[PDB]
From Swiss-Prot, chain A:
Protein name: DNA-directed RNA polymerase III subunit RPC3
Cellular localisation: Cytoplasm; Nucleus
Alphabetized Gene3D superfamilies for the sequence: Winged helix-like DNA-binding domain superfamily/Winged helix DNA-binding domain
Entries under Pfam families matching the protein: HTH_9, POLR3C_WHD, RNA_pol_Rpc82, RPC3_helical
Organism, as annotated: Saccharomyces cerevisiae (strain ATCC 204508 / S288c)
Assigned protein family: Belongs to the eukaryotic RPC3/POLR3C RNA polymerase subunit family.
Curated annotation (Swiss-Prot), chain B:
One GO term (biological process): tRNA transcription by RNA polymerase III
GO CC field: cytoplasm; mitochondrion; nucleoplasm; nucleus; RNA polymerase III complex
Role summary: DNA-dependent RNA polymerase catalyzes the transcription of DNA into RNA using the four ribonucleoside triphosphates as substrates. Specific peripheric component of RNA polymerase III which synthesizes small RNAs, such as 5S rRNA and tRNAs. Involved in recruitment of Pol III to the preinitiation complex. Involved in the configuration of an initiation-competent form of RNA polymerase.
Species the sequence originates in: Saccharomyces cerevisiae (strain ATCC 204508 / S288c)
UniProt protein name: DNA-directed RNA polymerase III subunit RPC6
Keyword Nucleus assigned: yes
Gene behind the chain: RPC34
Subcellular location: Nucleus
Annotated family: Belongs to the eukaryotic RPC34/RPC39 RNA polymerase subunit family.
Swiss-Prot record, chain C:
Family in the record: Belongs to the eukaryotic RPC7 RNA polymerase subunit family.
Function recorded in the entry: DNA-dependent RNA polymerase catalyzes the transcription of DNA into RNA using the four ribonucleoside triphosphates as substrates. Specific peripheric component of RNA polymerase III which synthesizes small RNAs, such as 5S rRNA and tRNAs. C31 is involved in the formation of the initiation complex.
Protein location: Nucleus
Protein name listed in UniProt: DNA-directed RNA polymerase III subunit RPC7
Organism lineage: Eukaryota, Fungi, Dikarya, Ascomycota, Saccharomycotina
Other remarks in the entry: The acidic domain is essential for its function.
Part of the whole protein covered: 36 to 70 of 251
Organism encoding this protein: Saccharomyces cerevisiae (strain ATCC 204508 / S288c) (Baker's yeast)
Binding partners and assembly: Component of the RNA polymerase III (Pol III) complex consisting of 17 subunits.
Domain of life: Eukaryota
Amino acid sequence: SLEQRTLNPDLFLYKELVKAHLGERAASVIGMLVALGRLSVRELVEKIDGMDVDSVKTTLVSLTQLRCVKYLQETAISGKKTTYYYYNEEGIHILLYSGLIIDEIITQMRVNDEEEHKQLVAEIVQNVISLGSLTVEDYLSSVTSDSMKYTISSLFVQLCEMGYLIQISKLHYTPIEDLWQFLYEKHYKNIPRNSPLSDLKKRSQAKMNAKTDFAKIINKPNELSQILTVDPKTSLRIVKPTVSLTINLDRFMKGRRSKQLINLAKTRVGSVTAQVYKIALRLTEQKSPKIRDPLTQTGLLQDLEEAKSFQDEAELVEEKTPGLTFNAIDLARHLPSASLINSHLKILASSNFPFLNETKPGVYYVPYSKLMPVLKSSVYEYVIASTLGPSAMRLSRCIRDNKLVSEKIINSTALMKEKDIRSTLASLIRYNSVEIQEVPRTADRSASRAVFLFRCKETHSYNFMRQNLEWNMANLLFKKEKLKQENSTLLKKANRDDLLPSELNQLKMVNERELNVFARLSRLLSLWEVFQMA
Amino acid sequence: ELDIEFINSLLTIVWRFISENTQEILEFITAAQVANVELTPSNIRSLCEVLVYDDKLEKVTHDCYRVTLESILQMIFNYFKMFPASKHDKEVVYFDEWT
Amino acid sequence: FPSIPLPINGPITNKERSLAVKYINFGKTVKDGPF
């Protein structure tokens, strides 16, 4: 399969997601936007061929409903209004994490047991977004007229006010940079001429006004003050029925981050304190620091006097946020013993891994900005010990703390024989955990008259890992659809009935093996999502 | 110290000493009739840094040493009890063959 | 033909076996639906 292993960036991942479960005609057009960047319809039809101009719009409305693209309108002084169309990178991640949301509703809503909406609440996620958008009038107007709909309608305000059901708007459907320009030009046209002093600061006068506007306008959909209708009759509280809403990835990805952190605890403590840590981890999940950092996405990240300000205030926000600094007193009532609440938390500060390490005395909270870099350094070194030799695990840590290691001190600091490390180091240049630094002791940088120095380079090592896993995801996805190509005449017969006795065998052996594909992918996708905390 | 092997025989004993829970090490190595001729604080600090690179113990307060509880793994981060099928299975994941 | 596999090679557990059924019906709603 050397054809596939060469020419494939993350475009081979992104093209095949709509090729997996959608019509075929949209896999062609989604590859065009990722390869070309941004383009409207008036130049789209020149790029593709085999799709009519309205058949583009017939195709474009399919991933429009599923929020898989994001548009932008810009008009010219001389020309008409031009609708530049971009790609949505998170709306297609919903198709990636599609099954995992169903296992998130159950493992986070544990107040109910043996309920008669277990089959139903697993279907609401299949109802809210497989249709695309969703409003309240869509499911009440189903085949069930009442069937105790008021119980079901009151069930979702329990399911919406916990999060990840934010009302959609233009903000969810427009990207992050094409909003910021005309609002910065709005603040810039708020400051006219007749202030000539410090004009370099007057250019930044709109920029200080843009920072407060950016946090304000991003909280407008997160503002829960208008997502509810206080009903004086036949109910007590209800969401507004005229709200079009889908899922939000933000609380899920923070919630998926929350499951990732406790797996370090089960390695770094036993079964008691990991159970103690699991409960208090849950309470801070609904209000947590943002994983994607929309401030740092695209903007003034090139200058360090601004690039420092993206974590100077963000540490002060995480430190001075009221909705996570627990008193370590309310933890005993949530566990199904305030001394043991303090004594089993004492091990969390004693370890050199900064979770529950720094705090004000009497109050306790878990830090975020200085914790997620330790988790990324921890798992990959274990992956080196997992898929290849543990001698590299010794060598990866030796070059880690010892900056600019030489070939003499590597046998002074680490203690192995000479022939084995050549059989271990040389695979790490190939996989880019170590790098080369050269000292020219002769003229014109002679290769033989030079000794070579090493480095960890904690950025390039993880970039190689990401595209190594993005390909391995789509490689297993490539082996999904090709198995459905053969033996298709009886899968068509397996979908026309809702019986040859020997033909049924060739449907189960192909079905048990694809069952292993989703399980290994779920094991694989958790290892990759550790490194989107950027 | 000596370039030939059997440093790991010295390495495995001191890992058992800290697991039950740098000056403490010097007398413990002198006991148990070990086959050594020259103990020094420099070599014990040199012997200990390898266990830091193997994460068999932890370094705290610049001189104290704790265990990272590797012993419960010694007995997802669960790299044993994970047997591959590798026979008549074409849909297996490989770490090479993308470079 | 290539060596060095990843260490994730396991029989599927019932904890995630129902999780894998949530995928095959998900695309069945989409493909057999409108699109």
